[PDB]
Design a binder for this molecule. Structure first.
Ligand SMILES: O=C[C@H](O)[C@H](O)[C@H](O)COP(=O)(O)O
Ligand SMILES: O=C[C@H](O)[C@H](O)[C@H](O)COP(=O)(O)O
Ligand SMILES: O=C[C@H](O)[C@H](O)[C@H](O)COP(=O)(O)O
Ligand SMILES: C[As](C)(=O)[O-]
Ligand SMILES: C[As](C)(=O)[O-]
Lengths: 248, 257, 260, 248, 245
C-alpha cells in the first residue's frame, strides 16, 4: 500500500541506503546519477541487498523493456520517471501488464487519471526537478487537490463533460467521486528541501514526500534525513519542526 | 440493466425507424415493415405534446420512440412516465443544455443519442446511451451528412480495433473519448451498442448505401408521407435496407418513387 | 436591515412569479397559485419603469406580493416604486439600462430588490450592493430554456466549488471571479447563496419549470406567454404544480397534455 | 446662472408660452429636429417676443458667424451644439470674444475644461440625442463628476500630469480643485423623458436639465412640462415624483 | 509604530546598533532564498528589546508557524524570498502573531488585508538602491486611496471589481479616510532625503536594508535615517544629516 506519511529517499549506493533506512525512510529510490537511462542493475542490487525496506528504481517514460528488466531484478516499485530522458514522447508504459507496481508523475488531475488508467499504483505530484524550489511541488499539489475537491462535490451528471475538459477517463473521475480522493497514494516531489517544506506538502494534502540526493550533500545526512522524516510524520507539530530546523 | 437496454436496441438490426406525426402515418409505417416509429409534433423545438405521443402509442404494436431536447432531464422523465419504449435525446430539437447531456444511466427506458465521430459516440455511451444515431445535418435530403459521419466513426473504430493496446490511453485523449469505452470497442471489434445512420436518407439506394458503409440500420423522416404513395415508398426503403446487396431488387424498387 | 429583507425574500421557495399587465391577469396568476406577480406595461425603443397607474391597478387587484421592474442604475425609478408601496423592486436587465457601470445601491432602501446574474461573480456583486434576491437568467423573450440552464448550471457549479474548496484559496478565487470575498465566505459557511435564487429565461413548459428546480433553482419567473395561451389559468396552474412537485413525473406528464 | 431649472425646446410662440407657464427657467428656440443649421431668425424672434424668460438658440460647432448673428438678434444664450451639423471638426468658437454667454456640450472633464478655456459660460453634459434613453446623460454625468471628485481631492503636485492625461488646461483643473466643483453651471441633457429621469440627473449631481420637443408630442404638454419642472426642483421628494408620474 | 524605521540585521551586533540608533524594530536575516535558520533569529531576539521581525516565503504556511513558535514579534511574508506558492498567500487570520505583507497597488493591499495582514509594506523591486520603486507604488496606493475616500458610495462595488479588491476593505478605507493598517515604504531607501521623501508621500514609516552596515559609520548612518524619518519636514536638519555619509 506504501505507508502514508512516509518519506522516500534517493540513494546512489549501499551506504546512503542504510542511512536512509536508519533515518526512518519508508522506501529508497536507487539511482546511478546527455541521455539518462535505467541504472546499471549492479547498482540496484547493491541497494536491494543493503536494506530491508522497499526499493524503487526509475525507468525512462515508455521504456517497456527497462521496466521488464527491473521487474526481473526483483525491484519493489518501478518509477516511470520524467527526470530520466523520455524514450517515448506519446505513449507511457502499459503498466497493467506488470506484476510490480508503478509510481508515475503528474501535474494535474487529467494526467493523474491517465496514469491511473495505464495501471499506475501510485502517484508523484511534481513540477520541475533539481531546483531546491518547493513552488513546483506546491503548484501541482494545489492544482491536483483543488481539481479533486471539485470532482468530489460536483453534480454527478456533469462528470462526463468534466472528464472531456480535463482529458481524464470518466471512470477514474467516478471512482474519485465515490472515494472522496484518489484511488492511489499521491506523494509530493520537487524541491522538498527543509523540514518545513516537507510538512507544508502534508498540509497541502500530500500522502508523503520524495526527497533527493541533497540530503547526502549535507554535513550530517543522518540528522537531516531524520529531520525530514519526523517533520513529515508530525507535520502539525510546529514546535518540533522549529527545533528540527535549527541544526540544518 | 445496461445489457437488457442494449439487447432491446440490438434486436433492431437491419431495420428502419420512421418519423410519424399521427396514428395514420404510424399505421402505414408499421404496415410497411418499420421496426419502430418516432413520434413527432413537427423557433424553439421541444418535446412533443404527450397527447400526440399517446395517439401514436395506441395506434401500433411496434416500439414507439420520442425525442427530447438535449440535456432536458425532465422531458425525458415525462416520456419515461408515459411508457415510451425509447427516448431520443435529439440535436434536431432546440438544445436545453449546451454543455451537459442527460445522465441516461439514471433511467429505466433506453436512450438513442446522436454522434458525428467516435469521441462523441464514446461520450454518449459513458452517459448511458443504449443506441447511437450517426448523423450530420438534418432536413437536407442530402445523404452526404450521414455518409461523412458513418465513414468517420467506422474508420475510427477500425483504427482502434487494430491498434496497439498500449496506445489507447493516448488515442482516447486525442479523441476526447473515455478509454474504457475504447477498450470495450477493441474487445468487441465494434461499438457495444447499435449504430443507425440518419440524415438525408431519401432513396432506397441511399438506405442500402448506409448499410454498405457499416450502419446497423437507418432512420428516415417525414418525407415518406409527402410522397404520392407513402406505403409503397416506406416499403421500398424497408426492403432496400434489409436486402442491401440485392442490386436488382433495389433497382426495381427505385422505379416507382 | 438586510436580515429582515431576506426573511421577506425567503417566503418565496418553490414558487412561481408571473408577469402581468393588468388586474385581470394578476387575479388569474393569484388564482393559479403564483407566489407573487410582476407588474408590467408591455419592437425597438426605450423600456422604462411602468406607469404608476398600471402598478397600482395590479396592487389593488391581488393580496399576494407585487413586484415591478426598474432600469439598471435608475435610483429614482426605484425610489418612486418604493414610495408607491411595491413589495419588491426588480432591477432588471430587460429594461433599457440607465447606467452601464453602476447598479443601484440597494442597501439604502427599505424595500427588497431582486437582481439578475449570469455567474457567481455577478451574483456576489449584486449581493454586496444589497440585493435581497437573485434571478439567474440569460437572454429574455426567446422561449428557449438554454439561457436559464447555462447560467443556473454555472452559478451552482461555482457555488459547489466554493463550498468545498480550501479556506485559504478563497481570496484568490474571489479575485478570479470578480466577487467580494466576504460573500464567498458567507456562501462557504451556509453551503449555498445567502439569498433566494430563482431561474428565469425561456421557462415555457411545465417540464422546463421542473427542470430548473432539478438544477437547483429556488423557484421560477415566467413571462406573458402564459396569457397568450388558449387557457391561461390552466397553463399558469400547470407551471405552478410542476414547480412545486418537480420530481412527480407522472403528474408533470399529465399536466403537459393540455397545453397548445 | 439658474440651478435646479429645466430648459425646454420650443418651435413657436405657443410652445414657448406653455414652457414659461410650466415653470421653465429658459427656452431653446428651434426650427426642427440632411444638414441642420442655425434656425431662421424669424422663428427665434417669434419666441423672444412670446416670453420674458431667457431665450437660447443653437449654432453649429465652430460657426463663428452664426453665433455673431444670434448675438446681434439679442438672444440671451448661444448653444454651440453638437446636434446641429458641425461647421468645424477641429476648432470650436472662441467664445471669449463674445458678449453673449455660451453653453457647450461635454462628455468628460477634458472636454469640459477645453470648452471653459474657449470661454464657455455654461455646460451641458450629454451623450447621444433623440433616443429617449437616459443612459447617454447618465454615462457622462457620472464620468464628469467622478473625474471632478478625483481632481478635488488629489495631491496638488499631480494636477499637471492629470491635465496632460485628460487633455485639459491645468488652470481649469486648479480652479476646479479650488472651488470643489466646475466654475460654471452644468446641466444634464440626452434622453431626459420622465420625471424620474429628471430627478435622477439631479441625484447624480447635475445643476439642471435640458428637455426636448417630446414634451409637446404628449397629450397634455403643460401637465408634462410641469411634472418635469417639479421633479427637477423637488428631486428627493419621491412621493411627489411618484404622483407626478401617474398622468404621463 | 508610525514615523519609525525598521532595519535589516544579520546578527546581534547589528541589531544592537539598530536599537541604539532608534529603530522601532529590526528584521532578522541570514539560488533559493528561504526562511532564516532559527538560530540566527534567536540570536537577534536575545540581543534587543525592540520588536523583531523575520521573513517567510510567500505561501509558506509552515515556515510561518515555525517563526510563530520561535516567539517572533512579526512575520514578513516577503516577495524578496523565493515564493513557495505563486497563487495563494498564507491565510494569516489563522495566526496569533501579526504579519506584514508587500503591495504595489490598492488591489493587492486590500487582498493582503482580507487574508489577515496586520501591516503593509508598499514596495517595488528590491536591492537597487533606487527610490523610484518605492515612489511609484506609494504614489499609486495613496492616489487610489484618495480616490476611494472621496468617491460616491454607490460606485465602490464597481471600483472593487476593477481593482480586484474586496469591497468591504474599500468600504472600511472610505470610512477611516485611510488604510486600516499601517503602511511603510520600502525599496531603495538609501539617503536621509529618500526616507523623508517617503514620509512626504504619505508613508507611515520606512524599511531600510543591509546597506547601512556596509557604510564606514553604520551607527551614524542608521541614526541619520531615523532622524530624517521622524523629522521629515525639517530640511535644515536633513541637510545637516546628509553631510557625513
Ligand atoms: O451531435 C453533436 C451535437 O451537436 C451536440 O450538441 C454536441 O456537439 C456534442 O457534445 P460533446 O461532444 O461536448 O459531448
Ligand atoms: O446581468 C448582468 C447585467 O447585464 C450587468 O449590467 C452586467 O452585464 C454585469 O454586471 P457587472 O456590472 O457587475 O459587471
Ligand atoms: O512579488 C509578490 C507579488 O506582489 C505577489 O506574488 C502577488 O501580489 C500575487 O498575489 P495577488 O494575485 O493577490 O496580487
Ligand atoms: C500530458 As500526457 C500525453 O504525458 O498524458
Ligand atoms: C475632442 As474636442 C474637439 O471636443 O476638444
Amino acid at each position: 500500500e506504501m505507508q502514508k506519511g512516509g518519506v522516500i529517499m534517493d540513494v546512489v549506493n549501499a551506504e546512503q541506503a542504510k542511512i536512509a533506512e536508519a533515518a526512518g525512510a519508508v522506501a529508497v529510490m536507487a539511482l546511478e546519477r546527455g541521455v539518462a537511462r535505467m541504472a546499471d542493475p549492479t547498482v540496484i542490487e547493491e541497494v536491494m541487498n543493503a536494506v530491508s525496506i522497499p526499493v524503487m528504481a526509475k525507468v525512462r517514460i515508455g521504456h517497456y523493456v527497462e521496466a521488464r528488466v527491473l521487474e526481473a531484478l526483483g525491484v519493489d516499485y518501478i518509477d516511470e520517471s520524467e527526470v530520466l530522458t523520455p524514450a517515448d514522447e506519446e505513449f507511457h508504459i502499459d503498466k497493467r501488464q506488470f506484476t510490480v507496481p508503478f509510481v508515475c508523475g503528474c501535474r494535474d488531475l487529467g494526467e493523474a487519471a491517465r496514469r491511473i488508467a495505464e495501471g499506475a499504483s501510485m502517484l508523484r505530484t511534481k513540477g520541475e526537478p533539481g531546483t531546491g524550489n518547493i513552488v513546483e511541488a506546491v503548484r501541482h499539489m494545489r492544482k491536483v487537490n483543488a481539481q479533486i475537491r471539485k470532482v468530489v462535490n460536483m453534480s454527478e451528471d456533469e462528470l462526463v463533460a468534466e472528464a472531456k475538459q480535463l482529458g481524464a477517463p470518466v471512470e477514474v473521475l467516478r471512482e474519485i467521486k465515490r472515494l472522496g480522493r484518489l484511488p492511489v497514494v499521491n506523494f509530493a516531489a520537487g524541491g522538498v528541501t527543509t523540514p518545513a517544506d516537507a510538512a507544508l506538502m502534508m498540509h497541502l494534502g500530500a500522502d508523503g514526500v520524495f526527497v533527493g540526493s541533497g540530503i547526502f550533500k549535507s554535513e550530517n545526512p543522518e540528522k537531516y534525513a531524520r529531520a525530514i522524516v519526523e517533520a513529515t510524520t508530525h507535520y502539525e507539530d510546529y514546535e518540533l519542526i522549529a527545533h528540527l530546523s535549527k541544526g540544518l
